[PDB]
Amino acid sequence: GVQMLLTIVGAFAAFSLMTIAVGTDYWLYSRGVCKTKSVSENETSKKNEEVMTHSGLWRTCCLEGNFKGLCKQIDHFPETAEYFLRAVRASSIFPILSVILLFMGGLCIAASEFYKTRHNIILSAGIFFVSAGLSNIIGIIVYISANAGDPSYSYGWSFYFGALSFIIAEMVGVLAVHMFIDRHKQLRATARA
Amino acid sequence: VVLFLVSRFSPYEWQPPNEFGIFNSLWFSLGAFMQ
Numbered sequence: 001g002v003q004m005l006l007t008i009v010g011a012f013a014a015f016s017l018m019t020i021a022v023g024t025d026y027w028l029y030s031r032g033v034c035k036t037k038s039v040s041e042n043e044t045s046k047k048n049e050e051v052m053t054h055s056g057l058w059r060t061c062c063l064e065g066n067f068k069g070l071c072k073q074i075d076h077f078p079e080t081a082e083y084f085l086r087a088v089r090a091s092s093i094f095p096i097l098s099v100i101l102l103f104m105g106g107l108c109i110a111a112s113e114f115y116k117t118r119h120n121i122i123l124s125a126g127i128f129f130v131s132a133g134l135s136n137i138i139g140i141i142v143y144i145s146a147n148a149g150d151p152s153y154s155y156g157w158s159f160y161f162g163a164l165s166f167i168i169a170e171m172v173g174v175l176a177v178h179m180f181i182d183r184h185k186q187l188r189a190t191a192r193a
Numbered sequence: 194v195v196l197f198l199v200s201r202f203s204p205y206e207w208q209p210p211n212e213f214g215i216f217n218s219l220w221f222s223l224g225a226f227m228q
């Protein structure tokens with residue numbers, strides 16, 4: 001009754017943090033471009049004014065400049081191992097798989113009360129949360145391992161909202177495994193008596 | 194977390210089958226890393 005509240009609260013927190021990380025564009029502070037090439041306009045002929053930016057997973061934007069707020073869509077594939085890494089960073093499957101697994105986790109917790117005898121639903125929740133954290137790990141590595149194949153950068157709050165989500169998800173996974181252990185420890189004692 | 198899970202989740206092993214709880218799993222991973 002009191003240990004499920006932390007699980008429910010933690011699962012919501014982790015899902016919320018991972019949905020705001022995926023959705024927002026504050027993953028990296030680079031110094032690039034945020035406007036398309038001004039062929040005719042010749043504002044800067046070809047290479048526009050590189051200014052401080054805040055990047056995410058899908059769109060790059062500009063903090064300062066005359067175009068402040070314009071947000072271009074990050075182009076991953078430019079011009080085997082490198083191609084596969086660019087297909088995983090472009091789709092962001094792992095940052096999005098974590099979201100789906102964090103969502104499935106909470107669904108199991110919701111189902112863990114309409115069926116109070118099926119103890120295998122609480123185990124599924126814990127597995128989804130642990131697996132969700134694993135996907136987060138892969139996503140973080142993939143994201144970092146991609147930004148190094150292109151050139152004074154810092155990480156934003158949306159990068160630390162996925163990192164925090166991993167910690168929350170792993171801790172919830174422990175609490176859902178402990179509840180499964182506790183549930184099965186309550187069915188042995190009765191059978192022993 | 195994974196070590197804790199794979200060691201203590203199954204009820205067909207429990208009193209506890211081993212000492213790999215969450216606290217001990219963290220200790221094991223730390224000692225392993227620190228050589």
Ligand SMILES: CCCCCCCCCCCCCCCC(=O)O
Nearest residue numbers: 097101120121123124127128131132
């Ligand atoms: C496609 C996603 C892959 C990664 C996540 C996979 C998680 C699978 C969890 C399935 C449920 C495990 C527990 C089932 C218990 C049972 O019915 O015996």
Ligand SMILES: *C(=O)CCCCCCCCCCCCCCC
Nearest residue numbers: 097127130131132133134135138
């Ligand atoms: C009995 O067979 C129950 C179903 C078994 C499911 C096995 C898979 C569990 C998750 C393992 C892989 C996790 C990967 C996490 C990152 C994607």
